[PDB]
Every structure is written in structure tokens, then in C-alpha cells.
A paper describes a structure:
Multiple strategies have been developed to modify monoclonal antibodies, including chemical conjugation and protein engineering. Recently, we identified a cyclic, 12-amino-acid peptide that binds in a cavity formed by all four IgG domains of the cetuximab Fab. Owing to the location of the binding site within the Fab, we have termed the peptide a meditope (medi-, middle, + -tope, place). Based on our observations, the peptide–Fab interaction does not affect antigen binding. Herein, multiple crystal structures of meditope peptide derivatives incorporating natural and unnatural amino acids bound to the cetuximab Fab domain are presented.
Of note, there are two meditope–Fab complexes in the asymmetric unit and thus we observe each interaction twice.
Author numbering:
A (entry chain B): 1 to 134, 138 to 220
B (entry chain E): 1 to 12
C (entry chain A): 1 to 213
Write the structure that this text describes.
Amino acid sequence: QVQLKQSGPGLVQPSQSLSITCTVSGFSLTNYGVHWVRQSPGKGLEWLGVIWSGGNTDYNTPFTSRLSINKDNSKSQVFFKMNSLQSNDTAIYYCARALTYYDYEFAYWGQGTLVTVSAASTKGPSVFPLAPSSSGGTAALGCLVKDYFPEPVTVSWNSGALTSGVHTFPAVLQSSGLYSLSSVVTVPSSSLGTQTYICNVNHKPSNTKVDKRVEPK
Amino acid sequence: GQXDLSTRRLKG
Amino acid sequence: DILLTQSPVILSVSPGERVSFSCRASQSIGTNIHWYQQRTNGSPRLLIKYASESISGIPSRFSGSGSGTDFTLSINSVESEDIADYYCQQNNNWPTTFGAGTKLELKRTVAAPSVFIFPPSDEQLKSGTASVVCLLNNFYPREAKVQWKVDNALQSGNSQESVTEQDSKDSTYSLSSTLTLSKADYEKHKVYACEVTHQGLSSPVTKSFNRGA
């Protein structure tokens, strides 16, 4: 069906440019316009601009100077570029398509690109096990994803096959300037002997991809 | 009332 | 631009109840308004286009009404899966603008938490740092207190809490409290306790371990 898949989450240094690629499928860029919307702490949902079927572009008034949108119809790719970013440009940027080619009711969205504007350096996390031991036949276990920058980090269990009972807590910013979160899952104690439990940690900004096996100590 | 980047949810 | 004022900031109801979302425009925008749902870590989801028109794949309990400056999004029989933020978007005037949103919380019966304490791994101790984690699993309401003690010494300022959003199925919360110590500090002590205070517990629950066993 109709899908919009954006490029991976990124860190941008202050005063430098942001570049995002929106690859579409299920429709042709010649028949629909692609809009760009961001969601920031200080302004919430904000419409940035759009590239139409025929190639024309409109940019929202505060971005006419530093916003630039292009596309490659044959490759089904739309290219978002914004210049001279600052801290209040830290937001989740979406590409979106409307129901009709001319309208603005966005029925299809990209997964979003979390953009962090910071002078700090990228840092991959360390994954530590939260080992169960000796609750009425229910054992809790998890992984500690510690000391990474910037956000985000993806955590699944058993390559996605284990979702029931999973809780992935929001990241907390430590005093060191690095993020840290945990992901837990509750399982039957009896399964701890005949089942393997792996957390799949992936920190795309640092290309850190780690699978941690969590066993009873 | 503000949007939190860590959850895509409104917090305060 | 057009200012959209959503009201209230937070809505708290019980499953099966009726719930309405207010979106007021700074001037008449006719019916040119669209509603959006956004779950945790998700993208906006189109619920209603042009104040009242239905959207494909949207449950029939979602409907919208209103015209001019006062618009309403309604859920007749709200369900646990409806826990999300809800935004309105106008497009009668350029550029299209969004509201600030309304958070939809769901009331449910009190649930005592399941508490689990996790010692630091031997792997992390090699890095010169000890992290002790206490898990408060599937509880309601959100209010909860975690008290750390190290050899009966009250810990303060050296822990951080993280709380999940409401679960889409059982509407409960989960909390993780991480006590962080230097490895030297951790090795100088034995008893590591996590005391949990919650409305669903008649008495505080304490999970603890001794460093080593």
C-alpha cells in the first residue's frame, strides 16, 4: 500500500544544514504532492512546506530563506534540506501525503526523523543485562542501554517475536550529557530454561547494533 | 502542554 | 496565522464513557478542519477530515461536528486503545496550522505494582560504574514513590525515574528507578533495598539483595 519511509535519525551541529530523504511507494510522485511537517517542544505541529506533483514548492513564511525541497520522480525520492539550524530546530520531522493531490488532509505520514541540534559527539551505548533471579511464576528481565548520544535507540526482543509484556521506558538524560534507558519484559519463570531472551539494541547515529542475551545469573 | 521528544506525547 | 485553541489540555475518562474534544479557531474557518490521533512514539493518524467526514479504517465511534469557530471531536464509547493525544488542523487560511492538542487519559481500577530489583551486572562493574534498577510493573494510578537504601542509608539525588505512558490494553503504568553509584561505592556496601509506596499497597513493598548473594 501507500508508504513513506524517511532516512535515519541524525545529529546536526549548530548553524549547519539538515538533510532528509523521503522515499515513497504505493503511488507516483507525479500524481501527489509531498508535505513536510515537524513537531518541536516549543511549537508542536508545524507545517514547513510542500513539493507538488509538477515540481512547484511552497515554503511556510519563517522557512522561505533556509528551506529547500527537491525530488526525483523516477526514484520516488523527495529531498528535504534546511539550513543554519539552531537548538530550537530540534524536533521530529515528518514527510506526509494528503488524500488528494491538491489538498492538505494528511492521511499518510513517514515514521519521522528525530533531529538533534548539538555540538556534542555521537556516542554508541553499552548494553547490560537486567538478570532475573528468585513473582508467582513470573520473572522479570531486561536490558540497560546506557551512555549514548544522541537519541533515539530502538529495542526489540527476540527479533520482534516477543512483544507481550515488553516495556521500553523513555530515555532519561544523565548529568554527563548522555542518554540512558531500560527495556523490560515479564515472562514465565519456567520458560527461562527452554527459551532464549535477546534484546536487539540499535543506535543508528553511531552504527551500534548489539544483541544482548539475558540469562539468570 | 509541551511535546516531549522522548515519547512523541504531550507532557505539561 | 490562525490560532487554534484546544480544550481541555487533559481529558480523563473511564472506558465506555463519552468524551468530546474542543477546537476553537481565532476566526471563522467554516468546516475546513481535520482531526488527528497520535499514540506514543507514533505519527499523526487522520481521524476526521472537514469537521465531520469519515476516514477509511477509522472506528465508527470517532465522529466530529462544528462549524465557524467551534468544533468538536467525539468518541461515543471510548476504549483503552484510544489513549493518545488528539490534534485539530485548520486549512481555511494559508498556512495550515495545528492546535496544541489534548491528552486523553483513561481511568481504571487501582492496580498494585509488581516490584523487581536488579543488581548491576558484572559486565558494567568493569566500566567503573554500578547501576541498580528497581522495576514497578503494571500499576495504577501513576503516583508512586521509590526509596533507595544502602546499608540502611537513605539515598538521595543519585537516582532517576522513568515512567511509561498508559498501556493501550490494561491502561496501567510501569516505572523504572535507576540508582547509580561508583564501583568503589558499590563494593563498600552490602544491602541494596528498594522500597515502593503506592495506593494499591496497604504497606510499602521492599525488594532487596546483598552484593554477592
